[PDB]
Design a protein around this ligand. Structure first.
Ligand SMILES: CC(C)CCCCCCC[C@@H](C)CCC[C@@H](C)CCO[C@H](CO)COCC[C@@H](C)CCC[C@H](C)CCC[C@@H](C)CCCC(C)C
Ligand SMILES: CC(C)CCCCCCC[C@@H](C)CCC[C@@H](C)CCO[C@H](CO)COCC[C@@H](C)CCC[C@H](C)CCC[C@@H](C)CCCC(C)C
Ligand SMILES: CC(C)CCCCCCC[C@@H](C)CCC[C@@H](C)CCO[C@H](CO)COCC[C@@H](C)CCC[C@H](C)CCC[C@@H](C)CCCC(C)C
Ligand SMILES: CC(C)CCCCCCC[C@@H](C)CCC[C@@H](C)CCO[C@H](CO)COCC[C@@H](C)CCC[C@H](C)CCC[C@@H](C)CCCC(C)C
Ligand SMILES: CC(C)CCCCCCC[C@@H](C)CCC[C@@H](C)CCO[C@H](CO)COCC[C@@H](C)CCC[C@H](C)CCC[C@@H](C)CCCC(C)C
Ligand SMILES: CC(C)CCCCCCC[C@@H](C)CCC[C@@H](C)CCO[C@H](CO)COCC[C@@H](C)CCC[C@H](C)CCC[C@@H](C)CCCC(C)C
Ligand SMILES: CC(C)CCCCCCC[C@@H](C)CCC[C@@H](C)CCO[C@H](CO)COCC[C@@H](C)CCC[C@H](C)CCC[C@@H](C)CCCC(C)C
Ligand SMILES: CC(C)CCCCCCCCCCCCC(C)CCCCCCCC(C)C
Ligand SMILES: CC(C)CCCCCCCCCCCCC(C)CCCCCCCC(C)C
Ligand SMILES: *C/C=C(C)/C=C/C=C(C)/C=C/C1=C(C)CCCC1(C)C
Length: 222
């Protein structure tokens, strides 16, 4: 289409759809209750992202936000996606290490704050305050990363996959605040189409690459 980032939204739609169908097919037959949860979470995540990617691709998940005296294209549909998929991703981690309920509530809650303040920052029309919201959201993110590293005798398989995915998590999730800051939601240093490319590469890796690593490990089986 006529938005140059369409190709990345189309590619992301395709890859999230394909990942969803792959994991769907893959978890066919699975009968281990514990495995079941990881497959459910793991399939649901790019399923949701598939729909929100599609929503962006078709223009529904896009709005215009006036700031800097300009009419700025903001893909709000990403926060609808992340609002659900990032806690689910954190749930995969939390389940893996058998986290306490209170740690799960702290993560999910921190995560909703992260995304909702990100969303608020995304939609805020006073340019400076956009970054106040960025900052609070980043602080929730840093809280989450804190908890993933310092907040948790588990099976060596679980520990191993958990350390890998945790690593994967810290490196990819940390990139999102940077992209937002330098891209069109923030300082407008990086153009929207490049930003969408970046978020697509992060999202696919954070969702599909992450679940391919998780769904590969025997850590998911009781
Ligand atoms: C991911 C897999 C390959 C990517 C598929 C792409 C889909 C086709 O893109 C069309 C855009 O209208 C090509 O026309 C656009 C006109 C030009 C043709 C571009 C298509 C090819 C350049 C795409 C081939 C894949 C590239 C791979 C890029 C690096 C890869 C190793 C990550
Ligand atoms: C999970 C797991 C599964 C997630 C599934 C993925 C798909 C989720 C997509 C959802 C997105 C909803 C779209 C909507 C919020 C965006 C509004 O855009 C409309 C058209 O541009 C606005 O017109 C008019 C606005 C209309 C009003 C819509 C309001 C709705 C009301 C439902 C709210 C409920 C909770 C209310 C809290 C009190
Ligand atoms: C650190 C703690 C909170 C920071 C205190 C600040 C001090 C007040 O700032 C005044 C500047 O004249 C507010 O007026 C400026 C007009 C506007 C009002 C801005 C004040 C609030 C936006 C500051 C509230 C704290 C913010 C938190 C930013 C992210 C935080 C989680 C790191
Ligand atoms: C702070 C900036 C504003 C934002 C950038 C934040 C990057 C966060 C990544 C930090 C990581 C630290 C690792 C945690 C600890 C792990 C230690 O494990 C090892 C086993 O004993 C310790 O030995 C060896 C430990 C090793 C630790 C070395 C860390 C590396 C160096 C980090 C690069 C520098 C940051 C560059 C600044 C940026 C603004 C260009
Ligand atoms: C993805 C971007 C587009 C490109 C940047 C890619 C950077 C790749 C560096 C990642 C490294 C990860 C380490 C591999 C693992 C090693 C684990 O060893 C430790 C021993 O148990 C694990 O505990 C502790 C493990 C420690 C791992 C913490 C990783 C550090 C955090 C990485 C910084 C963030 C990336 C910032 C994004 C960028 C766009 C500004
Ligand atoms: C410890 C604290 C409590 C943490 C809270 C931090 C709040 C950050 C508030 C952002 C504010 C400082 C920046 C306001 C915009 C300022 C750069 C430019 C001033 O007005 C400009 C022209 O009149 C706006 O046009 C447009 C100019 C734009 C192209 C400039 C982009 C703005 C950039 C803001 C970057 C903030 C990050 C560096 C924070 C990293 C930590
Ligand atoms: C998952 C995918 C399959 C991976 C394949 C990715 C392919 C990347 C193709 C690059 C393409 C998107 C960018 C095309 C240039 C575009 C920024 C500007 C459009 O036209 C400009 C003015 O008409 C060109 O002038 C000049 C403007 C220049 C100053 C702009 C520099 C371009 C920059 C491109 C950066 C690409 C990296 C961000 C990729 C990181 C991953
Ligand atoms: C009781 C304790 C822990 C601290 C009180 C001492 C006073 C110092 C200020 C707070 C410092 C503690 C956190 C250290 C790490 C940081 C990254 C602090 C960043 C400071 C800047 C803005 C964030 C808000 C703050 C007012 C803490
Ligand atoms: C059979 C397997 C392993 C995967 C098929 C599921 C579908 C999803 C798409 C491929 C995902 C797997 C790799 C995860 C990591 C990444 C960094 C993917 C980046 C995607 C974007 C462009 C690169 C080309 C791709 C089409 C894989
Ligand atoms: C499914 C995709 C994932 C894992 C997306 C993760 C997104 C984040 C970690 C977002 C973080 C942000 C902040 C820390 C700063 C403000 C803006 C955000 C929402 C991009």
């Amino acid at each position: 289409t006529g938005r140059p980032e369409w190709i990345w939204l189309a590619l992301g739609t395709a890859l999230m759809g394909l990942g969803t169908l792959y994991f769907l097919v893959k978890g066919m037959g699975v009968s281990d209750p514990d495995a079941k949860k990881f497959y459910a979470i793991t399939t649901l995540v790019p399923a949701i992202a598939f729909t929100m990617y599609l929503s962006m691709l078709l223009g529904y998940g896009l709005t215009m936000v006036p700031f800097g005296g300009e009419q700025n294209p903001i893909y709000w549909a990403r926060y609808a996606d992340w609002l659900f998929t990032t806690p689910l991703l954190l749930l995969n981690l939390a389940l893996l290490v058998d986290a306490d309920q209170g740690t799960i509530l702290a993560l999910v809650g921190a995560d909703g704050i992260m995304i909702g303040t990100g969303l608020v920052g995304a939609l805020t029309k006073v340019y400076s305050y956009r970054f106040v919201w960025w900052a609070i959201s980043t602080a929730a993110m840093l809280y989450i990363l804190y908890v993933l590293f310092f907040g948790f005798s588990m099976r060596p398989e679980v520990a191993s996959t958990f350390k890998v995915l945790r690593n994967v998590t810290v490196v990819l999730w940390s990139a999102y605040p940077v992209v937002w800051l330098i891209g069109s939601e923030g300082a407008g240093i990086v153009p929207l189409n490049i930003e969408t490319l970046l978020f697509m590469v992060l999202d696919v890796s954070a969702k599909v690459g992450f679940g391919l690593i998780l769904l590969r490990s025997r850590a998911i089986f009781g």
